[PDB]
Amino acid sequence: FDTNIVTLTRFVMEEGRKARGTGEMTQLLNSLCTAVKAISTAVRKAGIAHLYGIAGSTNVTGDQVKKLDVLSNDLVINVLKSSFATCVLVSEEDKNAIIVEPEKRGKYVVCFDPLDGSSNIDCLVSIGTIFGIYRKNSTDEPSEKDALQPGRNLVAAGYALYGSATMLVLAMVNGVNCFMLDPAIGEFILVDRDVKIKKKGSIYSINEGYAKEFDPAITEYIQRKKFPPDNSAPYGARYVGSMVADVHRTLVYGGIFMYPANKKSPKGKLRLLYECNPMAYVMEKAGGLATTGKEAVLDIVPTDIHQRAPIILGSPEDVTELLEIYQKHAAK
Amino acid sequence: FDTNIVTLTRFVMEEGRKARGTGEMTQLLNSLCTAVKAISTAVRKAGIAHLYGIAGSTNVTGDQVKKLDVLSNDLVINVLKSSFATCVLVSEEDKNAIIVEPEKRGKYVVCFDPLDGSSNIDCLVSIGTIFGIYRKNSTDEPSEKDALQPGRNLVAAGYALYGSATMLVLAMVNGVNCFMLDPAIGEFILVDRDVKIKKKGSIYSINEGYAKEFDPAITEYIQRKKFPPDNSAPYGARYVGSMVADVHRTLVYGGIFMYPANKKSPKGKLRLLYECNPMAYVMEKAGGLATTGKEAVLDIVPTDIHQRAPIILGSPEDVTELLEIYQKHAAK
Amino acid sequence: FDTNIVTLTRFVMEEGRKARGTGEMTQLLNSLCTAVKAISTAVRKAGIAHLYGIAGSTNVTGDQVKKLDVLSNDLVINVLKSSFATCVLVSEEDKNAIIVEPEKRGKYVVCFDPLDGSSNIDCLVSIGTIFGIYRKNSTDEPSEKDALQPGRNLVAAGYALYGSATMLVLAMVNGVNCFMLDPAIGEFILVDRDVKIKKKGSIYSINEGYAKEFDPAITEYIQRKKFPPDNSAPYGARYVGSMVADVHRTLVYGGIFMYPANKKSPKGKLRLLYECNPMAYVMEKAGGLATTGKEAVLDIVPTDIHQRAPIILGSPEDVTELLEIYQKHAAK
Amino acid sequence: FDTNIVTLTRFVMEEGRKARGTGEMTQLLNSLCTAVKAISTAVRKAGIAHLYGIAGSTNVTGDQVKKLDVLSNDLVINVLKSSFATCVLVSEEDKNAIIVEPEKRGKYVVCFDPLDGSSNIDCLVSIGTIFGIYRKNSTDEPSEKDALQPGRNLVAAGYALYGSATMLVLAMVNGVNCFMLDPAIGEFILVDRDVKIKKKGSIYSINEGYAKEFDPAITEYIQRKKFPPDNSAPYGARYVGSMVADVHRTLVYGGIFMYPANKKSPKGKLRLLYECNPMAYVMEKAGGLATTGKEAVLDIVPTDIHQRAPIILGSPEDVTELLEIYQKHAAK
Numbered sequence A, B, C, D: 001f002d003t004n005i006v007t008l009t010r011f012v013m014e015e016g017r018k019a020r021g022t023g024e025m026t027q028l029l030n031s032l033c034t035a036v037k038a039i040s041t042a043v044r045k046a047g048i049a050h051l052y053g054i055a056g057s058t059n060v061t062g063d064q065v066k067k068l069d070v071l072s073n074d075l076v077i078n079v080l081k082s083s084f085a086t087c088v089l090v091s092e093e094d095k096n097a098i099i100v101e102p103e104k105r106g107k108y109v110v111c112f113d114p115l116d117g118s119s120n121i122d123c124l125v126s127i128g129t130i131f132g133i134y135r136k137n138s139t140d141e142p143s144e145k146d147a148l149q150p151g152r153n154l155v156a157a158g159y160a161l162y163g164s165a166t167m168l169v170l171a172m173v174n175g176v177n178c179f180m181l182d183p184a185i186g187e188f189i190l191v192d193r194d195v196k197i198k199k200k201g202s203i204y205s206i207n208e209g210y211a212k213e214f215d216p217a218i219t220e221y222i223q224r225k226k227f228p229p230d231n232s233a234p235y236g237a238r239y240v241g242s243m244v245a246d247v248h249r250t251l252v253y254g255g256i257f258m259y260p261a262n263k264k265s266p267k268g269k270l271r272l273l274y275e276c277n278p279m280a281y282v283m284e285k286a287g288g289l290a291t292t293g294k295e296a297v298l299d300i301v302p303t304d305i306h307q308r309a310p311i312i313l314g315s316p317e318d319v320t321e322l323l324e325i326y327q328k329h330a331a332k
């Protein structure tokens, strides 16, 4: 049997032992883990519980809200508040930032996507929860501005993946580690230490249904993945449709994931605060790259908690190849 | 609480009540359900249990065997034998058919894929188990020939999907029904009755990495999905990479799934006995279509338990559109 | 991993293979197993689900009904009906016998106690479900009379024990076997084969709070267990308070369990149909004995589906010792 | 669904919010909760996992060690060390105190019984885990002496009960609260707030098999419980055999539990450090009493980490009644 179980709690406590912190990061992550287990359990039996379907509302980004978006959002909001580790919260499901009541205030600002992969819920395909954590910079009263920090300022970011197994991928200043949920004891156990992405992959991931709207650079790159100029084997294609799933595969298999800007969407579709930045952080800590095609995602200074951003991430050699193409097409 | 739980066992027993059978179909399905729950539990904690990785072997179709292929295969083989409902078994993982020992012989022939979606195991993307059940036709001693029946002879077929939730999709002569696994009591509960696929979808699913090998018909169809000649909205793209996941989404969302024959693979990649036929059966019972591009999958008389077959399935209007293109290109 | 799991279903199917039955016993037990798992799951989280407390009613035997009695009763009634294996049902919670509607009729009569150990529910002490199964003897329309058979006519009996682990103890014509519920896959797995009770134990079990009402024989026996006339070590005492728990310990540890008739209760407290008979059957098949103090429990021909009966059971040498005392005191 | 789950972690963090502690008590309890869930899961499937049986050793108190004692002991020892909240550990299973290595040292001393109720493991009757927590008093290097504190110095104590449901009963300076384990998400949820024991119960709990060794006071009290001098109804008897189970029932139902000193055991059987003191603390915080028959358990200054102590606890009026009897018999 276990007897010496290596949990996310222990792992996090241990590494930050000689950094003598306040300890609230641990409180924060422990809290998030509780909500993640609750979301997982609900998702695992969503049909029997009648949790599929719309809630009857639309969020600021214009998505039709689902029952599971509400359940997961409430779950995350409640546990984060109770953690005594947060002050400002940003969620895809909330029009404005949520200022934590004075009595339960902590030093962290948490941006999160309660349930990523909306279109894949009803078909039982992988979905998840994405988060990014910042330290409140200002001395002012906590406000929405505290969430308007560039991703390079993240102190922690990651995601929960409700796939064939539930995984919690956590990135911090020194690296990325994967923790898998043990359903029997409800604990996230370390399974992959210091994850590093391949320098070059052999899988490209993008929705080719938008081919008519793709810019010449994306068009050229895809054509190149199918018809290699050097006659190497063409890349395989994979597109689950849920950002969390496609990014996770990219992380452990290598390759590239793309949700670029197209002729109808100047800033792409994915949201910078709770989708792009967290994944960008994970990628960089794994030795990968994350760009919009013209600048590093983590360097963007946001002006809107719900603003969108194009994103191309994954193996450094793959991303760089596409950046070279963008630059080749760069028109003044 | 439940109190009146509608299980797969009850559901199956009830419908076939006034058909006064021997009752072994129920025994068969009950047995398969046990193995499916065992596979699901293992998959849900594969990382912690060290179940990821190769087993150190290659099957007849040339796939590198994984630890989970072995575990799932053994699990399925053992429960089916113990069911007293089978005589001949065909598995992707076994070179030859397995003849059930006389003492435990039943009247059914079961073709199955213990674990579908090999490439997606390590990245936690949806995987599953596929099966097709036939009644032994001959009076001869049970043999591999008993598995060489055309899919139109199936009396039952379906699949287990280990996705965000575990689902058991079962098709029989009168229709398709979905049952979701309730982790707490280990029972498959009815969640979707008499499932019917949309006449026309808006999602196409195929690995576009093989574009250089696609025949002109597949090439034309894809181009048509991206650039509609009538200026309707282009179809969205989705390709999880695991047959079971892509087919399931096709079933409940509508649209089309393709794994065609290409310039390097005359008969495509997917196996007819335990991949193509079962899914083809499910599709037809849901009012969908399943073709190779030139003939109906279910009408193919197999000559090899491991033979391959091209497959195009899903919404009738989508499949028909592609068939028209194939016929347009048909060269004598 | 498992791969060759030995379930109650398989075990039952296998032993009765060369007895060529209709197969409905298996259907019956499979059904009962589903309800047992549902009861277990509910019990395991009764506090969180607010399932503790009275329902607001009294049964024929005068017990105050609990929410869990209702939940478990409904669960058992529903699954048994759906099994197509029963015709008459007797439950501690139903005033009169339940005649199964014609369409779902089977040949079995099932007497059951949906939830045994009422006083121990709120304190989280072991509780269970007890059942006894008879074959309908008559040719008449099914009626309450069909349940009025002496326990020696049982073809199957046993109990579910919701203790530190959930166990299903099943006795049939050839012996007793224990099956433990595997929470992960929701299957009862064989753990103890052909259980036999010790010829003589060293534990006596009875509620000594009724000492003022005990007959001289019970009084003498207890005194003898505390002050052995031969100076052997006195028996240890154990009285959980739930029949199922005390009887189970008696079965695997040996010894004796008593709920005798006292000065205020001529027929004791425990009910013959769904408490005494099933346990008496289990005991005898394990090589134990079960008496009222004057006659064998299994030989009593009941006149009331809810009648009570004194019961003394366990190790043959222990029971016989007490019977000798009863006979020593026997007054004409 | 949940969405606002009230866990032991949250509950503990919240109450001690305005006490501005180091926060290690929370770390300690969180750690203990992980081990408790692991023990529970193992216990729930002990038979299938082959965890029943002896380990092949004897502890200082002379008990034959069981496989589950080892598993639970290792589990508790490992999590407590990893908590960074302890310095000295005392376990029924370890001859000497365990001094936590400098690097993982915390300010707490934890006395614990990894698995209580040894005799009841094989029969599936309720078992548990008992603990008592002290703050290191001295300034010296941590040593076994740090565990030799009187129970009145406890800052926290409680127990895990692996019964029909798993409960974590926690007592601290201001009171007792019960938390039930939710198997689905592996979280202890608050179910009973500020538990208080009845002033007078109607159940007595003791092993009457030792009647030949009982002192006159215990003898008189028992006789009085069976034959009330005022003709009130006699108390009911209950004796599960596992301290944790009997004490828990005493707490929520009221009444009295006894494991007195007898003619052959001057100090009774139960151990003061990890059995008597913790339960005594829980009882007092619930408004109950706990005595040896001559002095308060919590006032005893231990001289041996494994010393034994008689114990009588429960409803104040019941305990006081017995104390009066002891005093009536008090011989100089």
Ligand SMILES: O=P(O)(O)OC[C@H]1O[C@@](O)(CO)[C@@H](O)[C@@H]1O
Binding pocket: A012, A016, A019, A020, A021, A022, A023, A024, A025, A026, A155, A156, A172, A173, A174
């Ligand atoms: O304990 P505190 O004060 O919350 O902060 C410490 C944390 O900072 C980091 O998130 C920085 O990446 C971790 O290294 C560490 O757990």
Ligand SMILES: O=P(O)(O)OC[C@H]1O[C@@](O)(CO)[C@@H](O)[C@@H]1O
Binding pocket: B012, B016, B019, B020, B021, B022, B023, B024, B025, B026, B155, B156, B172, B173, B174
């Ligand atoms: O009970 P038997 O004899 O195994 O066969 C009956 C079965 O045939 C079918 O599979 C035909 O599609 C079901 O309708 C039914 O459960």
Ligand SMILES: O=P(O)(O)OC[C@H]1O[C@@](O)(CO)[C@@H](O)[C@@H]1O
Binding pocket: C012, C016, C019, C020, C021, C022, C023, C024, C025, C026, C155, C156, C172, C173, C174
């Ligand atoms: O399959 P049927 O017809 O229901 O009856 C067979 C059963 O009878 C018994 O219950 C007799 O004790 C079992 O031996 C056996 O499973």
Ligand SMILES: O=P(O)(O)OC[C@H]1O[C@@](O)(CO)[C@@H](O)[C@@H]1O
Binding pocket: D012, D016, D019, D020, D021, D022, D023, D024, D025, D026, D155, D156, D172, D173, D174
């Ligand atoms: O957080 P620290 O420093 O470990 O100590 C605080 C704790 O002391 C107590 O255990 C005292 O009973 C709790 O009130 C509280 O959680």
Ligand SMILES: O=P(O)(O)OC[C@H]1O[C@](O)(CO)[C@@H](O)[C@@H]1O
Binding pocket: A116, A117, A118, A119, A207, A241, A242, A243, A244, A259, A269, A270, B236
């Ligand atoms: O259907 P599309 O446009 O390809 O969008 C897929 C994206 O939608 C999202 O669900 C966000 O709305 C992401 O998880 C995912 O990558």
Ligand SMILES: O=P(O)(O)OC[C@H]1O[C@](O)(CO)[C@@H](O)[C@@H]1O
Binding pocket: A236, B116, B117, B118, B119, B207, B241, B242, B243, B244, B259, B269, B270
């Ligand atoms: O990588 P490819 O060639 O697109 O193959 C995907 C197919 O491989 C399989 O795993 C079969 O080997 C199917 O589940 C799936 O549809």
Ligand SMILES: O=P(O)(O)OC[C@H]1O[C@](O)(CO)[C@@H](O)[C@@H]1O
Binding pocket: C116, C117, C118, C119, C207, C241, C242, C243, C244, C259, C269, C270, D236
């Ligand atoms: O409290 P008493 O009278 O000892 O009764 C205990 C008996 O009560 C029952 O709950 C039946 O009502 C049995 O499970 C148990 O053996």
Ligand SMILES: O=P(O)(O)OC[C@H]1O[C@](O)(CO)[C@@H](O)[C@@H]1O
Binding pocket: C236, D116, D117, D118, D119, D207, D241, D242, D243, D244, D259, D269, D270
């Ligand atoms: O068998 P006995 O002597 O009554 O002992 C019971 C006691 O034994 C213990 O298991 C301790 O060894 C306690 O849990 C329990 O109360």
Ligand SMILES: [Zn+2]
Binding pocket: A063, A092, A118
């Ligand atoms: Zn959305």
Ligand SMILES: [Zn+2]
Binding pocket: A113, A115, A116, A117, A243, A275
């Ligand atoms: Zn998202």
Ligand SMILES: [Zn+2]
Binding pocket: A092, A113, A114, A115, A116, A117, A118
């Ligand atoms: Zn979202």
Ligand SMILES: [Zn+2]
Binding pocket: B063, B092, B118
């Ligand atoms: Zn394969």
Ligand SMILES: [Zn+2]
Binding pocket: B113, B115, B116, B117, B243, B275
């Ligand atoms: Zn496959």
Ligand SMILES: [Zn+2]
Binding pocket: B092, B113, B114, B115, B116, B117, B118
């Ligand atoms: Zn396969």
Ligand SMILES: [Zn+2]
Binding pocket: C063, C092, C118
């Ligand atoms: Zn009752």
Ligand SMILES: [Zn+2]
Binding pocket: C113, C115, C116, C117, C243, C275
């Ligand atoms: Zn009962």
